[PDB]
Structure formats: C-alpha cells, structure tokens
Write a structure and sequence with these properties.
The complex is a heterohexamer, with three copies of chain A (42 residues) and three copies of chain D (35 residues).
Chain A (H helix, E strand, L loop, with lengths): L1 H40 L1
Chain D lengths: L1 H33 L1
Classes of the chains: A mainly alpha (42), D mainly alpha (35).
PDB class: antiviral protein
Keywords: Fusion protein, fusion inhibitor
Assembly: hexameric
Amino acid sequence: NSQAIDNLRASLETTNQAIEAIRQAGQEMILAVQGVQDYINN
Amino acid sequence: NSQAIDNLRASLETTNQAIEAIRQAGQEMILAVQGVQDYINN
Amino acid sequence: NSQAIDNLRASLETTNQAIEAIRQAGQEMILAVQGVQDYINN
Amino acid sequence: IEEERKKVEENLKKAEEKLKKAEELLKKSEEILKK
Amino acid sequence: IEEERKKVEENLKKAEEKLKKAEELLKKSEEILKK
Amino acid sequence: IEEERKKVEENLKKAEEKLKKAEELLKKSEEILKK
C-alpha cells in the first residue's frame, strides 16, 4: 500500500509538470494567432 | 495512509480540473484559427 | 486502502492518456497556424 | 491556397478529434475516481 | 472582416481566461500534494 | 509584415519546445506509475 502511495505521488507531481508545459505552449499559440490577427487588423 | 490517499484523490480531482480548463482553451484556440481560415476562404 | 490505490492508479493512467491527446492536439494546432503563416509569406 | 486550406483544415479537424478524445478520457478518469 | 476580427479576439480572450484558471488549479494541486 | 511574421514563427517555436518537454515529462510519469 505504502510503496504504491509514494509511487502515485511521484507520478502525479510529474504529470503536473507535463500539464504546466502544455499550459505554457497554449499561451505561446495564443500570441501566434494574435500575431496573425494583428497583420489582418493593420 | 487512509488520509495520504484522500490527499492524492483531492490532488488528482484538481489536476483533472486544470486539464479540462486547458482543453477548453484548446477548443477556443481551434475556433480562433478557424475564424482566420473562414475569412481567407471568403 | 489497497482498492482506493488501484482506483487512483487507473484514474491517473487514464488522465495521462487525456494529456497525451491534448499534447497531440497542440502539435496539430501549431501545424495549422504555420500553414496560415507560409501562405502570408509566399 | 489549395495546399493551404487542405493543410490548415485537416490539422484543425485532427486537433478537434484529439480534444474530443481527451474530454472522453477525463470523464472516464473523473468516473473511475468517484467509484 | 468585422465578424472574423470579433470571432478570433473573443475566443483568444476566453483561451487566456481558461489558461489562467488552469494555472490556479495547477498551483492548488501542488499545494495539496506538499501537505 | 516583418514584426508579425517573427512574433508568429518565434511563438510557434517555443510552443513546439514546450509540447516536446511535456511529452518527455508525460512519458517519465507513465514509467514511474508502471513500477
């Protein structure tokens, strides 16, 4: 039980690090699409 | 352990809430690129 | 405690697959915006 | 603009399919969690 | 054009919102693990 | 057009590098869970 609990916590804190990367990638993609709307707008 | 589990449960539910949010951001990003495409096509 | 654990394992295995898919989606959204950009340049 | 629409439309179609797949797997993960 | 501009900017605005909400939830998830 | 172009290609570059980083981290987590 105790090993698997320590396993799960290790896994999940890595998973959170992955999500944090996908989340920063999202913010960058938004700036890129805004890049395109800025050339159209101007 | 009983309660270290509930702490991992609480954490995974919240992680699951963070992913669902980024997923809604994805859908919205797709709508934004499709808006650029619709304009080019027309 | 043992069954609460295996359920957390299976929930995080599934959560990791959801993230993999969101990851692949963001790779597709980059190719899309890049396609738009190449048309503007060319 | 035939190579452009083909490449953008197909990538947005694939992105949308992956985001729907991910929604399916989150609902599955949330449900496994309730149980 | 006007509809194109509106559609893009409102969806991009809501994407930011959702990615802020996600950040907050991530920092919460971490808080609960440390406990 | 020079500014717009680079703002868009620079941001798709750092996005792409964030997405590969997340794949590294996600593969890592699947392997840690498997044990």
